[PDB]
Design an enzyme around this catalytic site. Structure first.
Site, PDB file in Angstrom:
ATOM      1  N   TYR A  19       4.023  31.348  63.042  1.00  0.00           N
ATOM      2  CA  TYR A  19       4.822  31.710  64.326  1.00  0.00           C
ATOM      3  C   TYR A  19       4.032  31.017  65.503  1.00  0.00           C
ATOM      4  O   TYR A  19       4.525  31.341  66.491  1.00  0.00           O
ATOM      5  CB  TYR A  19       4.861  33.313  64.398  1.00  0.00           C
ATOM      6  CG  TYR A  19       5.228  34.094  63.164  1.00  0.00           C
ATOM      7  CD1 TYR A  19       6.288  33.493  62.360  1.00  0.00           C
ATOM      8  CD2 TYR A  19       4.574  35.247  62.662  1.00  0.00           C
ATOM      9  CE1 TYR A  19       6.588  34.309  61.128  1.00  0.00           C
ATOM     10  CE2 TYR A  19       5.000  35.731  61.519  1.00  0.00           C
ATOM     11  CZ  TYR A  19       5.850  35.470  60.818  1.00  0.00           C
ATOM     12  OH  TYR A  19       6.135  35.730  59.662  1.00  0.00           O
ATOM     13  N   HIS A  24       5.959  30.851  71.840  1.00  0.00           N
ATOM     14  CA  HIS A  24       5.287  31.943  72.237  1.00  0.00           C
ATOM     15  C   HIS A  24       3.728  32.102  71.835  1.00  0.00           C
ATOM     16  O   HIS A  24       3.336  32.991  71.361  1.00  0.00           O
ATOM     17  CB  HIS A  24       5.905  33.289  71.894  1.00  0.00           C
ATOM     18  CG  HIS A  24       5.844  34.285  72.718  1.00  0.00           C
ATOM     19  ND1 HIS A  24       4.855  35.202  72.640  1.00  0.00           N
ATOM     20  CD2 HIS A  24       6.526  35.092  73.531  1.00  0.00           C
ATOM     21  CE1 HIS A  24       4.887  36.531  73.357  1.00  0.00           C
ATOM     22  NE2 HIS A  24       6.031  36.024  74.027  1.00  0.00           N
ATOM     23  N   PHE A  70       0.759  41.805  68.216  1.00  0.00           N
ATOM     24  CA  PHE A  70       0.915  41.544  69.691  1.00  0.00           C
ATOM     25  C   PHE A  70       1.817  42.472  70.381  1.00  0.00           C
ATOM     26  O   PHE A  70       1.811  42.523  71.622  1.00  0.00           O
ATOM     27  CB  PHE A  70       1.335  40.208  70.101  1.00  0.00           C
ATOM     28  CG  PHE A  70       2.908  40.064  69.617  1.00  0.00           C
ATOM     29  CD1 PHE A  70       2.957  39.358  68.439  1.00  0.00           C
ATOM     30  CD2 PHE A  70       3.808  39.978  70.392  1.00  0.00           C
ATOM     31  CE1 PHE A  70       4.188  38.787  67.955  1.00  0.00           C
ATOM     32  CE2 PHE A  70       5.219  39.491  70.026  1.00  0.00           C
ATOM     33  CZ  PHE A  70       5.415  39.086  68.717  1.00  0.00           C
ATOM     34  N   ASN A  72       1.949  46.521  69.299  1.00  0.00           N
ATOM     35  CA  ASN A  72       0.959  47.908  69.437  1.00  0.00           C
ATOM     36  C   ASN A  72      -0.432  47.579  69.388  1.00  0.00           C
ATOM     37  O   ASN A  72      -1.369  48.159  70.169  1.00  0.00           O
ATOM     38  CB  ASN A  72       1.528  48.803  68.630  1.00  0.00           C
ATOM     39  CG  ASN A  72       0.706  50.237  68.319  1.00  0.00           C
ATOM     40  OD1 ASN A  72      -0.165  50.191  67.704  1.00  0.00           O
ATOM     41  ND2 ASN A  72       1.104  51.279  69.311  1.00  0.00           N
ATOM     42  N   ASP A  97       0.677  34.596  76.969  1.00  0.00           N
ATOM     43  CA  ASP A  97       1.925  34.077  76.822  1.00  0.00           C
ATOM     44  C   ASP A  97       2.928  34.221  78.227  1.00  0.00           C
ATOM     45  O   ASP A  97       3.256  35.555  78.300  1.00  0.00           O
ATOM     46  CB  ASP A  97       2.702  34.144  75.628  1.00  0.00           C
ATOM     47  CG  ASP A  97       3.982  32.998  75.498  1.00  0.00           C
ATOM     48  OD1 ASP A  97       3.607  31.859  74.720  1.00  0.00           O
ATOM     49  OD2 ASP A  97       4.952  33.628  75.767  1.00  0.00           O
ATOM     50  N   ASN A 118       5.191  45.932  75.462  1.00  0.00           N
ATOM     51  CA  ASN A 118       4.207  46.570  75.025  1.00  0.00           C
ATOM     52  C   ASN A 118       2.628  45.977  75.112  1.00  0.00           C
ATOM     53  O   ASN A 118       1.992  46.669  75.911  1.00  0.00           O
ATOM     54  CB  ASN A 118       4.483  47.037  73.615  1.00  0.00           C
ATOM     55  CG  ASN A 118       5.880  47.794  73.463  1.00  0.00           C
ATOM     56  OD1 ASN A 118       6.972  47.108  73.218  1.00  0.00           O
ATOM     57  ND2 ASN A 118       5.774  49.344  73.373  1.00  0.00           N
TER      58      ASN A 118
END
Length: 197
Positions: A19, A24, A70, A72, A97, A118
Site C-alpha cells: 500500500y 498516501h 493508521f 486506530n 500524509d 481518526n
C-alpha cells in the site's frame, strides 16, 4: 525560536510496500529515508505496535515512529510512546500524509492540525487536550476535479509524478536539521518555499 527541541516524531501513511506504492505514503516515505541516511535500526516494538527509529542528527536524536494501523492503532501507538518518553507537545512532531497540499510541497504547522480522520485527530484524543502538537504537511494531492479528489488521494502515482513526492521528502528530512540548528522558522522558511513548480 524553540524552548525544547523535538524528542519524538511520528509518520502517518499506508504501511507495507503493498500500500506504500499508493500516493498516501507521505509519512512512510520520510521514515525509511531517515533510517537510510543515518543507517539506524527501525525497531518494530509491539509495545507501541509500530516501527520506530531513533536517529541523532546534528546534535539532537530524532525518534521517529510509523504505526501498524493508521486508523486506530496510530494514535494508540503515540499515546504510549509519548507517555513513557514523557515528551511534551512542543517536542512532539508528526509527519503525515497530506491531500490538502499539491505533490512535492511541504509546510510546518503549529497549533491546530487535524482533519476528519481518526489517525490524525486521535493523536489528540488519546493524549488528551493537546493542541500544542507540531506536525508538517507532505503534499501528495494534485488539484484536478474537486469532486473526484479522493481518487487522487489514495491512487497509485506513476514514478514521473512520484518524483515530485521524492523531492519533498528530500528536503523534509534535511530541514529537520535546520529546525533544531537555526530555528523552526528557518526550516519553515525552507519547507514551504520548496515546491514542485
Amino acid at each position: 525560536m524553540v524552548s525544547q527541541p523535538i524528542k519524538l516524531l511520528v509518520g502517518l501513511a499506508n504501511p507495507g510496500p503493498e500500500y506504500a506504492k499508493t500516493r498516501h505514503n507521505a509519512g512512510a516515505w520520510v521514515v525509511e529515508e531517515l533510517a537510510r541516511i543515518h543507517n539506524v535500526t527501525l525497531k518494530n516494538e509491539p509495545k507501541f505496535f509500530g516501527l520506530t527509529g531513533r536517529l541523532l542528527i546534528n546534535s539532537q536524536e530524532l525518534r521517529v515512529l510509523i504505526p501498524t494501523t493508521f486508523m486506530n492503532l496510530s494514535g494508540k501507538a503515540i499515546a504510549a510512546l509519548a507517555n513513557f518518553y514523557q515528551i511534551k507537545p512542543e517536542e512532539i512532531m508528526v509527519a503525515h500524509d497530506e491531500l490538502d497540499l499539491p505533490p512535492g510541497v511541504a509546510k510546518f504547522k503549529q497549533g491546530g492540525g487535524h482533519g476528519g480522520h481518526n489517525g490524525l485527530k486521535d493523536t489528540i484524543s488519546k493524549l488528551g487536550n493537546n493542541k500544542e502538537f507540531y506536525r508538517l504537511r507532505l503534499g501528495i494531492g494534485h488539484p484536478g476535479h474537486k469532486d473526484k479528489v479522493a481518487g487522487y488521494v489514495l491512487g497509485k502515482a506513476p514514478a514521473k509524478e512520484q518524483e515530485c513526492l521524492d523531492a519533498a521528502v528530500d528536503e523534509s528530512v534535511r530541514c529537520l536539521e535546520i529546525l533544531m540548528k537555526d530555528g523552526l522558522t528557518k526550516a519553515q522558511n525552507r519547507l514551504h518555499t520548496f515546491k514542485a513548480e
